[model samples]
Target: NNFEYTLEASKSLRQKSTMTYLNKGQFYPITLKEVSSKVRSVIMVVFAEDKSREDQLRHWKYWHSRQHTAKQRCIDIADYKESFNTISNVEEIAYNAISFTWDINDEAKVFISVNCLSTDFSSQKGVKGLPLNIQIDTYSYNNRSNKPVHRAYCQIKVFCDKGAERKIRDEERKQSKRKMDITVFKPFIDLDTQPVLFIPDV
Candidate 1:
């Protein structure tokens, strides 16, 4: 059985870093499903997080060894930074965050379309782009006490357009050739005794 709700994204989008990459102007759709179907609506907040700062936090060790604390800290920092969309902020400069109240459809499902672009990455210290932290902050139209129904996270990577096309195609060619097979035409070891030469039936 499915959980009351779930958030999902396309797994194919993940790259070596385990984070999904998207070209500028690319559309990444997020899906939310409510199996229990008790909730009528949700308030979704899409925050463009500070990837560079988050990386810096990972380097320091005053933080607890548990990831939960680290993750919470990242979200707090992202929220604080996003509060002011400064001209110099990479997340602000790269993309616009989304927030809105969405009502469930007949199927008890909702789709969120997220898009991003990085006008400049050179100024950013050591990251390709920003991370989009998406979450449903409210359920049943205003149940603040209830936990978020779904949460989806992914990062944006800006690069030269069409740069991946040739390599992507080449990958398929190399991939198909690498798959090999071993077929046996006959038994591993044939009978030592003469077979048909002395065949007899009773």
Candidate 2:
């Protein structure tokens, strides 16, 4: 008599796990909401002329260089440079707004400041006799996935006076588009355990 046996098998595959760092800032535990609130409350409003393209280009170059240098410095000071990778992606947005104060008193001065997790790279438009409408948007990247992402966005309208409000309404009815770049620096620090996987043999 002859006997035949069939074979059964199992296979296991391992793949590297990834952790995503969506939002990062040098200051920890401080939410963007908190920072925005502080900036809006204390910032002074100034009617300044729009910056020329050349001026904006210069500013961008300077900050980009500084960010590179700062990253190198952190690497030099840390044990495993990767652990202290403090620099994050940078992008520019826009800020447009009209500012006014109710208190005509000499001491009563109001200013508005806008802040975000990432930098802004747009120009500011000053409308002398109309309400100011500010809108901001930014582009960023996820280091792990190496993909681009657009972060927080906001739009605000401020009226300094009744005339300014009317002017804003009129402009809205007419439909106008303004462009500006408002850039800032943002850094990220990662501190987490690498993922591990386990498999049993059959």
Candidate 3:
């Protein structure tokens, strides 16, 4: 009877193992959530102007239903070193809508003082939704191959900094086209037309 017990216990406990962490304690667990806060700064918006010949002429050229899925160009948060916005666990909470390991790893609570500059420009004012793609990281939910990256539609407000009739000929232009009209007799040669030396009289 003792022989039976010895063999049974030996078979069950043989080749068993446990794991441990050997990390520097400088690291700490943090959690995060979406919080309502104002991103205070002067944001500049330049609308996508209609393409000119300079644009349409180049190559096979590409293009959008759709401007780009705005990139997180550069962020200007409360200026401080070691200040980071952990943009993880992303989703389109209004429309479209993560797990990993360790119960000790909390939701990574952080306040992302966010400011984004878009690849394309926009003059859209007032409170409205703008689509922004964010970079986030989350667990592969239970056990799934997941990429913690996604686009989220966010509501933004316009912080106007003296919006004037910008870049117009009243104050803006190349000022080179048909400049010397009397001498060259070129008159109003514009970007939209191929200049003809004279009109046909026939």
Candidate 4:
């Protein structure tokens, strides 16, 4: 019962009576049947806690322990994916920073393609257009051959920027028959090099 009882003997006779007419020797007592049947209930105040996971991450009680672990966990499975490389994977993929140099002077048949995505490199002329510094950022390829297993990503932004240009289909890598193109430099003994190279496997 949700009644406040303050009797002389402190009995829980909630529905029975309140004993308003108290004579000089009136007595109020608890019975064994009332307690055996669980008559009285303990009623107090109870408050619901903030059990939400996101809310508890900023809760006051867990200030020290849950601070950094929750942050590092978010670094992988989250929308803050700006640092992701050529592929849109979210993990411990190290950004490679290695490059090489190319000599386009002597080789007249060597083909290279550059596509202009903007007017940032368009040179003025009466005949045709001359474009350079392709896009937003001027990138230089730092192809790192130092690693044993080199992994190649198809798309690149910062290190290498090959703007949209059609490849030379079958003749891209084919060089025309050149006169006196004999071997000038050799790394093997009398043209006997390794059947296959094994420094990098990626």
Candidate 5:
């Protein structure tokens, strides 16, 4: 049978299947269960999704251009390109945490008691609110080529020390409200005074 498993969580943790919100340096549990017998280990890696250099440059430039300081805004494109090239592609948390994989011990169940990764921006920081990918892949001992047979992918956005998460949360709420038909209610003080007399006239 193919690898059969799901990412398990507590009642209070995840809001949905697609995205998870975690506080900075918080410890959380993840259980990978119902895996195939042949699966020997599970590899879990969390990293930001890849973007093209052109896209990355454009993204940084837009923010850079918004600076109030004329010196920052006037920096040469070649200097920006040089700095971009010098930075690491992946985040520190991804690199430090995914340095190893979970070893399977024949139970066909893998449980991480206290998995943690700092949600803070990495050394090569950019945008604060973009989501990162948390990927899990199962490796099998039975396969001759030693390849992973099953993979699960999900996204996570984290709370920051500067409280940027609340802003993102508000933005998300506004988007959800926009998608619905119900109007946001606002009270008119003048209407309250005339309501009793106006009702009889109307």
Candidate 6:
């Protein structure tokens, strides 16, 4: 008996604390929670979809839903069209793919962003002007020859008002200072995977 079991969670479990507005052809419900490092595993409910229009409905839907657990994903906004995928893992069998977008104008201020990768090829490309959509899905649990593979790809940028929210917050603070100058010039090995950049002021 090796006796190895490590599962103690609480990264982000948000259940509405003021921030739910979807005017143009509404549809809201963005819930996420999937924690289990293994300890008689049980607790998974990931649903991603929050639409808004009427000129982007005051755009603000940033994301980071427990940073990839074999592959988990999110991103969705309406009125200018934006929808990314993933958030469906039937008992850790694994499967996901996401791509997002948004850059609204005509009052309802917004500047959302997304970038995720784990490919199965659903090509996407749209920057600055904002406009792209891609989707791909494949899942398996039992009827397979040794299953275990997940993929996700998403990219979104939408800021249309207040001068595009100061030009996407000065281009995301100059791309996070050029990725902190390439992590201070070639120095790697921090599997802590940190990149939750947000620039909102309008």
Residue 19, model 4: Cα distance from true site in angstroms: 99
The pairs that clash in candidate 4 are: 98-142, 98-143, 99-141, 99-142, 99-143
lDDT of 4 by residue, 81-113 (tens): 221211121222211111112222211111112
Clashing pairs in 3: 30-108, 31-107, 31-108, 31-109, 32-107, 32-108, 32-109, 99-139
lDDT of 6 by residue, 88-168 (tens): 122322121222211111111111222332111113444223232221111223433332122121222222223323543
Off by over 4 Å in 1: 1-18, 37-95, 105-119, 124-139, 146-149, 155-167, 170-202
| Model 5: per-residue Cα lDDT over 141-167, one tens digit each | 665354445555545554544233564
Which candidate gets the maximum TM-score versus the true structure?
5
Report the Cα RMSD per candidate.
23.2, 25.1, 29.8, 42.1, 21.8, 19.8
Residue runs of model 5 more than 4 Å from their true location after superposition: 4-17, 35-38, 51-127, 161-177, 180-202
The digit string of per-residue lDDT tens for model 3 on 135-198 reads 2222234332332211111122211222112212322344435320000001111223221111
| Each model's lDDT | 0.31, 0.21, 0.21, 0.18, 0.35, 0.23
**Model 2, runs deviating above 4 Å:** 1-141, 144-148, 151-159, 168-202
Clashing pairs in 1: none
Q: How do all the candidates rank in terms of TM-score, highest first?
A: 5, 1, 3, 2, 6, 4
* Order by lDDT, highest first: 5, 1, 6, 2, 3, 4
| Candidate number achieving the greatest lDDT relative to the actual structure | 5
What's the TM-score of each model vs. the native? Answer: 0.38, 0.17, 0.22, 0.13, 0.43, 0.17
Q: Give the per-residue lDDT of model 1 (tens digit) for 48-121.
A: 45434444233222222432443222111123232222211212111122332333433323333332233232
**What value of lDDT does candidate 2 attain over all alpha carbons?**
0.21
Model 5 clash pairs are none
**2 or 6: which has the higher lDDT?**
6
